[PDB]
Amino acid sequence: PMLYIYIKTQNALVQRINFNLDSQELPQNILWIDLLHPSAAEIAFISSEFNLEFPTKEEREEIELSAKYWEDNATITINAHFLVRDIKLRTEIVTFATAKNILFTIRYNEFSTFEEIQARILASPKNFEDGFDIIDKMFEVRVEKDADLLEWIDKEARRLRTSVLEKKDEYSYDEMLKDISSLQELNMRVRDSLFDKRRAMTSLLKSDKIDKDIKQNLTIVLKDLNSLVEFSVSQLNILDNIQTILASQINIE
Numbered sequence: 478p479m480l481y482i483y484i485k486t487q488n489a490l491v492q493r494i495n496f497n498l499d500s501q502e503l504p505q506n507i508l509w510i511d512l513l514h515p516s517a518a519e520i521a522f523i524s525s526e527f528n529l530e531f532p533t534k535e536e537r538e539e540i541e542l543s544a545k546y547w548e549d550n551a552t553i554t555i556n557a558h559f560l561v562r563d564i565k566l567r568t569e570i571v572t573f574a575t576a577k578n579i580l581f582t583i584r585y586n587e588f589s590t591f592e593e594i595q596a597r598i599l600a601s602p603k604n605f606e607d608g609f610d611i612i613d614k615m616f617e618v619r620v621e622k623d624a625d626l627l628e629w630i631d632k633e634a635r636r637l638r639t640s641v642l643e644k645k646d647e648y649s650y651d652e653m654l655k656d657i658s659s660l661q662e663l664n665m666r667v668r669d670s671l672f673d674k675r676r677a678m679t680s681l682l683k684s685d686k687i688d689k690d691i692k693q694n695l696t697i698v699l700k701d702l703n704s705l706v707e708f709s710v711s712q713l714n715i716l717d718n719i720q721t722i723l724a725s726q727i728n729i730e
């Protein structure tokens with residue numbers, strides 16, 4: 478049950494404070510508040526200090542569980558999509574929220590993609606003026622990590638493509654089918670993860686809480702995201718065709 482507060486320092490750098498809710502005093506110049514394994518104390522803390530609640534039924538608005546983006550006059554909420562090990566992956570969701578120009582992330586597990594997000598924010602030369610600048614950089618880091626995963630699948634697909642097409646350096650036909658099937662699932666999960674981030678960034682673009690600097694950056698990430706979706710689709714066709722060729726060999730032989 479941990480609470481990390483990221484502040485903009487006097488020297489215009491970011492510093493991470495391991496914050497103790499029950500005793501310590503709140504810092505100045507907060508950029509981003511990270512809640513890991515929150516208990517009712519941490520949930521009570523952000524509500525009492527930043528007016529941040531998450532009921533699924535309220536009087537003022539119809540809350541739709543069939544969306545992953547919600548915005549009222551003061552806050553934006555995003556249930557953001559991540560992939561974590563279950564190689565077999567599974568969906569992990571992190572709640573993002575904005576209040577008083579501060580980014581909030583609420584997470585229930587620690588996973589490697591979020592550690593990479595932490596390291597990049599702490600080491601970026603970018604000057605973050607508020608929490609909206611943070612989420613801007615996070616979307617960029619998240620699309621890169623999805624790209625690295627498509628690249629890894631690409632390496633594995635080329636090895637399989639060579640092995641099956643030229644019938645050279647093959648192993649167990651069943652084992653090759655297991656791998657192809659595993660890569661197909663990874664490809665499908667990353668593409669869907671990329672679709673989720675497209676919908677969120679596009680909804681952020683419409684907010685008037687987001688200044689022109691962030692909208693320009695989200696647009697650049699969106700173009701690259703689209704490139705990765707194209708790459709993922711070409712890649713899945715290759716995997717499906719390797720599976721078809723491999724099944725053809727089993728049956729013919």
Ligand code: NI
Nearest residue numbers: 606688690691
């Ligand atoms: Ni700005």
